[PDB]
Write a protein that binds this DNA or RNA. Structure first.
Ligand code: 3HE
Ligand code: MG
Ligand code: MG
Ligand code: MG
Ligand code: MG
Ligand code: MG
Ligand code: MG
Ligand code: MG
Ligand code: MG
Ligand code: MG
Ligand code: MG
Ligand code: MG
Ligand code: MG
Ligand code: MG
Ligand code: MG
Ligand code: MG
Ligand code: MG
Ligand code: MG
Ligand code: MG
Ligand code: MG
Ligand code: MG
Ligand code: MG
Ligand code: MG
Ligand code: MG
Ligand code: MG
Lengths: 53, 167, 51, 148, 122, 185
RNA sequence: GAAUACUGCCAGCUGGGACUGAGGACUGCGACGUAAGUCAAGGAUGCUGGCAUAAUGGUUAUAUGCCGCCCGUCUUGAAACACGGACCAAGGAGUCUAACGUCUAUGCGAGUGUUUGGGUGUAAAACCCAUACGCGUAAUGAAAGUGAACGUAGGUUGGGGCCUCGCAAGAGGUGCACAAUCGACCGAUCCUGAUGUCUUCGGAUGGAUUUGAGUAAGAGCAUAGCUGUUGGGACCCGAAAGA
RNA sequence: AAAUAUGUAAGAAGUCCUUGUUACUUAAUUGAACGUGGACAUUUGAAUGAAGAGCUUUUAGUGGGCCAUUUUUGGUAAGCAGAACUGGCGAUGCGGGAUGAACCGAACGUAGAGUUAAGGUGCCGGAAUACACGCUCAUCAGACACCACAAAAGGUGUUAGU
RNA sequence: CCCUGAAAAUGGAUGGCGCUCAAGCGUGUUACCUAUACUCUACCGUCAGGGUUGAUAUGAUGCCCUGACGAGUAGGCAGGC
RNA sequence: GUGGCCUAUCGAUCCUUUAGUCCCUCGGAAUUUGAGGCUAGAGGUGCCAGAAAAGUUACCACAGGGAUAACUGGCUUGUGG
């Protein structure tokens, strides 16, 4: 990771300033659109009890 | 010496007050209190009397003349928080009340040396009452039972709930 | 010497946030929205009403 | 003075600072150096190692005056000259007229060599001298004469 | 931070605050940490003196940095003294607080109902 | 209730004033309190704090120590400041001409500096002629060369001096100090 | 095609009630006003009435409402069916001394300590003083013994303060105390063994995973105080015993 | 082969580039360790906090413990005996559990006001003889955790259900 | 849910009275009550950070500004009677 | 390869003794015996951080302990019923 950080900093020294070396924790998800085409939501309910004995 | 001394003493000069930001703005009265309204006195020597509201004086008092000819209440000031404003109204566009004010009602300078062990009305007051009361009565006679209503005293009967009563 | 609450005491409210005057003048707390007549898809309605 | 002691502060408090449970007693662990090898062993071994046992040989009827030999270092050697001839001798370092320092008269038995005297000749009279002390005196141009 | 909240679930009620809640919270109960002291904000010059190096010049800049989690959120949040709220004015709404919000209690994540709770608490 | 993360009502643990009742020391303290407040020079703050120190915390500074400090490159003309006592030293035979400001000069130290051509100065004269500690050089004596320090940290393998009244053979040089007598330390 | 419920927002308006009024010339931030000023804007002012004394208030006795088990002690646990205590006055228990540790104050400082003694006296005081002696300025070894600078009293890393350049940020220089570390020096141990020679003495030079309560531009001596330590009757009172 | 618990790292005492020392090491101008000089910008290399951070001296009391959840040993068991983690009591009042060291809530300068916690709201007793859907009638009903116990078994009592 | 199973010694204990479409049992929605807890304010003390000398109208261990904090046996220390 | 494949198989001060260095001391000065030192092992403490140690008291004493038995009570209920 130290080697990669040096490589990123040197590349940013040429182009793409503010390479933001630090790691980050997992972020909350961004917005998204979920299409129904071929994926119509369809599911059933909880199941009745039965013995299986 | 009995007691030694304080090494240093407080200053005896009086400190000036900081500037106060409290401007005196005029009272905003209740909506139901308009001149000509019949009031019910809840306190004082005239407890429970029906009177006529005439003028809002600059000391925040109300100038009332519950007609002296009717119930014996003269032209006098009352506190607005010690009256009940009723829905009954009398016209007051026939009376002249700009003369009555605080210096009109300025009582006296009672002398501290003046003392009483066991025990008249000003002249101008009676004609002022007569002049105001002439127009007041003239307007009062127009609708029946006002004279009787003003002569009668207000009181609470058994089962009366003033939080549900309409005055 | 004494903390005065904004959200009351409009003088302090105006000392902070000079934009409160424009907000109140233009009634930005009561903004009428532009109407639109887009309709949900029949698949959405059928899924919503499905058993 | 009694008025500054914690005894005055402890008035009104039952245990007088000694504790209700521990309850200050006479000699709960013994008297003096009792138990140095048994129940005070940890303190003895941690703070006074070498306390128990014998080392070395005895000397019957030792007289400390036999071993009288106070030491003087070269860096203090020039304080045996009174300060008012000191600067006069320090300038004009002369071999024909060099100060005589009688360290035995000053009360010393051996001259040691902590070193760096000024480069001035001096005649140092001593009972004993360390090898380095003599080498430094000779390097400065002086001499050590032995006395008894 | 989600792991931290999940580790302190039984003792906290938390959720997602709205702009109205954040603005009222900062306006009424917002105090700055200046030289280890709790200073009522009460003025924009205090904020520009202690957070002007991040481009935060007013109480609304501070609110903006909080509601939108900006680059200098950490500095602005740490500048804010922890808000000291009263007990809720209409109560907690439940007979027993120390169950999860899902189970009829008060603790845990109550995502958008934290707004109602905090509004009654301040 | 508050879940306290630190001890409450904790004193800073540093002296805010001299422990002594020396009136002249208190006058020096009030002078350097004014200077430390009305100037941004950290010299005044350092001198003010040193004015509070105890005797073991202000060890004497030898004139040989002063001469060695003045031998530093570019420090030949600086004013040596000792918040404490300057003692004499006979191990040195040459002494430079210099200004030394100190609380106290011993008779020998003062005589040696004056003979060398310099001057001995009090801290108030130092304050007058250098209100911001200009071209000063603060010197401190050896704190850990105190005899009490030898016994601090006594224990197995620590290499410290035992607290002992009589020395020599028969005095704590036996079992515990050599392998032939039990063990060694 | 609307309405309403539910939820949410307004830097929308407005009525009633309660507690509080800290501060004491001005300084600030604002607001309304062309400005002049004014304001609810870094904490209460204005108007009015009664009394001016037991009226308010304090104390005390009582009543009422609710609450309140006997202290001290040992104890995990006491109101205890645990022990001491009927009551009151007076007395009643961490002290002094020898030696000492840490800390602090003071004097003087490579020194320091007059008070064994002498001189003197306004006479157990105060004042003055020689030679010694104690501790300190050298350690190490069982001892015979030997005994502290290669060098700006060393190098490296930090290090306050100071200095130079900089509006600043900062960059350089110098860096006391202190901390870590590699060295150097003194003694002990082990090894090596020069010139020389009472031919068995002498021990030069050079080493070491060794060792010391050492050196490396001294800090100590004395007086006093709290706390702590040991011996003493030893915080106070208490045996069965022994001589 | 988990969960929980547990070690280390997430850089300036760092990284990279040239070349200096050695008596160690290499076949060797190979390395090892420590360095001179040069480069790295402000996201100097995750988050949150940091109440000042480090350092030293000296000395008190204590060295009988006990309780609760959870894990757990001996024992038929015990308000028994013995361990583990944590929180408590001891050393601690206050509101609640009538009463109670340890339970619940909450920890305490002196007051005022507001709001609550746990617990409650027929009367004692401050607060709905509230609202809503059901169940139960006991010739020994039942009525809030710790907690002041109840079982195997059985009933065309009555209710719902397969 | 109720009933049988269900027997102990002074008279007694859902805390008591009492309570039966409950004032019992299960559940749900509100309103209300009150801790030395939380919020705001005043005052006391403590701790911390600060201001104050072209004489601060001669107290600078004083005066003042700001913030936070306050349980306590054994025990320690401080200021006072 | 610095004992046993690893995890157990062992022992202070004083005294005695042996080995080593042929070294230091016997203090008026030497020589030789003798003695004492310095470094390293052994002789042993198993109550194993290491006193040198038989009973009895129904004639008994003292300091205490409900930190602890012999009676009630309390928890438990194996056993008993
Ligand atoms: C059993 C026998 C003696 C024993 C030891 O010397 C006994 C005691 C004698 C004494 O009074 N004081 C002590 O310090 C030790 C020892 O060394 C063994 C090897 C041999
Ligand atoms: Mg106490
Ligand atoms: Mg008592
Ligand atoms: Mg006691
Ligand atoms: Mg004890
Ligand atoms: Mg023993
Ligand atoms: Mg309410
Ligand atoms: Mg009672
Ligand atoms: Mg007893
Ligand atoms: Mg008795
Ligand atoms: Mg008695
Ligand atoms: Mg008495
Ligand atoms: Mg006694
Ligand atoms: Mg006997
Ligand atoms: Mg005990
Ligand atoms: Mg106890
Ligand atoms: Mg109960
Ligand atoms: Mg209770
Ligand atoms: Mg709980
Ligand atoms: Mg009830
Ligand atoms: Mg009631
Ligand atoms: Mg002899
Ligand atoms: Mg016997
Ligand atoms: Mg007999
Ligand atoms: Mg007991």
């Amino acid at each position: 990771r130290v080697k990669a950080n040096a490589a990123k900093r040197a590349e940013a020294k040429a182009q793409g300033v503010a390479v933001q070396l630090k790691r980050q924790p997992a972020q909350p998800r961004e917005s998204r659109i979920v299409s129904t085409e071929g994926n119509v939501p369809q599911t059933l309910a909880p199941v009745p009890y039965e013995t299986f004995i | 010496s009995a007691q030694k001394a304080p090494k240093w003493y407080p200053s005896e000069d009086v400190a000036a007050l900081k500037k106060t930001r409290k401007a005196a703005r005029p009272q905003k009265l209740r909506a139901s209190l308009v001149p000509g309204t019949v009031l019910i006195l809840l306190a004082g020597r005239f407890r429970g009397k029906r009177v006529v509201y005439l003028k809002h004086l600059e000391d925040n008092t109300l100038l009332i003349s519950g007609p002296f000819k009717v119930n014996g209440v003269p032209l006098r000031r009352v506190n607005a928080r010690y009256v009940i404003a009723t829905s009954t109204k009398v016209s007051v566009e026939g009376v002249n009340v700009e003369k009555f004010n605080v210096e009109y009602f300025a009582k006296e300078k009672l002398t501290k040396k003046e003392k009483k062990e066991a025990k008249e009305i000003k002249a101008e007051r009676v004609e002022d009452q007569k002049v105001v009361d002439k127009a007041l009565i003239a307007e009062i006679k127009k609708t029946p039972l006002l004279k009787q209503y003003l002569s009668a005293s207000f009181s609470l009967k058994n089962g009366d709930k003033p939080h549900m009563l309409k005055f | 010497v004494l903390k005065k609450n904004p959200l009351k005491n409009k003088q302090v409210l105006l000392r902070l946030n000079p934009y409160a005057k424009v907000f109140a003048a233009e009634k930005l707390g009561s903004k009428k929205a532009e109407k639109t007549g887009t309709k949900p898809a029949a698949v959405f309605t059928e899924t919503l009403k499905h058993d | 003075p009694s008025r500054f002691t914690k005894t005055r502060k402890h008035r009104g408090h039952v245990s007088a600072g000694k504790g209700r449970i521990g309850k200050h007693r006479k000699h709960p662990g013994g008297r003096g150096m009792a138990g140095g090898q048994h129940h005070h062993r940890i303190n003895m071994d941690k703070y006074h190692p070498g306390y128990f046992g014998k080392v070395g040989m005895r000397y019957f009827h030792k007289q400390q005056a036999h071993f009288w030999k106070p030491v003087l270092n070269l860096d203090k050697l020039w304080t045996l000259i009174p300060e008012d001839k000191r600067d006069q001798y320090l300038k004009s370092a002369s071999k024909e007229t060099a100060p005589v320092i009688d360290t035995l008269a000053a009360g010393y038995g051996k001259i040691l060599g902590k070193g760096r005297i000024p480069n001035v000749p001096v005649i140092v009279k001593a009972r004993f001298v360390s090898k380095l002390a003599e080498e430094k005196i000779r390097a400065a141009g002086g001499v050590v004469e032995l006395i008894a | 931070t989600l792991e931290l909240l999940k580790l302190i679930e039984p003792y906290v009620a938390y959720g997602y605050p709205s702009y109205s809640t954040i603005r009222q919270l900062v306006y009424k109960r917002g105090f700055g940490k200046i030289n280890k002291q709790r200073v009522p904000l009460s003025d924009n010059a205090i904020i520009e003196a202690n957070l002007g190096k991040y481009g935060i010049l007013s109480i609304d800049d501070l609110i903006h940095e909080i509601i939108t989690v900006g680059p200098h959120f950490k500095q602005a949040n740490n500048f804010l003294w922890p808000f000291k709220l009263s007990n809720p004015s209409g109560g907690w709404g439940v007979p027993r607080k120390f169950k999860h919000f899902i189970q009829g209690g008060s603790f845990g994540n109550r995502e958008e109902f934290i707004n109602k709770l905090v509004k009654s608490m301040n | 209730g508050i879940d306290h993360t630190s001890k409450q009502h904790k004193r800073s643990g540093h002296r805010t004033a001299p422990k002594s009742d020396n009136v002249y020391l208190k006058l020096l303290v009030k002078l350097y309190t004014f200077l430390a407040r009305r100037t941004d020079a950290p010299f005044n703050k350092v001198v003010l704090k040193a004015l509070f120190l105890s005797k073991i915390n202000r060890p004497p500074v030898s004139v040989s120590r002063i001469a060695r400090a003045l031998k530093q490159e570019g420090a030949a003309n600086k004013t040596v400041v000792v918040v404490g006592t300057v003692t004499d030293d006979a191990r040195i035979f040459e002494f430079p001409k210099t200004t030394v400001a100190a609380l106290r000069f011993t008779a020998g130290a003062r005589a040696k500096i004056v003979k060398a051509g310099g001057e001995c100065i009090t801290l108030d004269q130092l304050a007058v002629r250098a209100p911001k500690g200009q071209n000063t050089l603060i010197l401190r004596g050896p704190r850990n060369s105190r005899e009490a320090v030898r016994h601090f940290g006594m224990g197995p393998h620590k290499g410290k001096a035992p607290r002992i009244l009589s020395t020599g053979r028969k005095f704590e040089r036996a079992r515990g100090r050599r392998r032939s007598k039990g063990f060694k330390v």
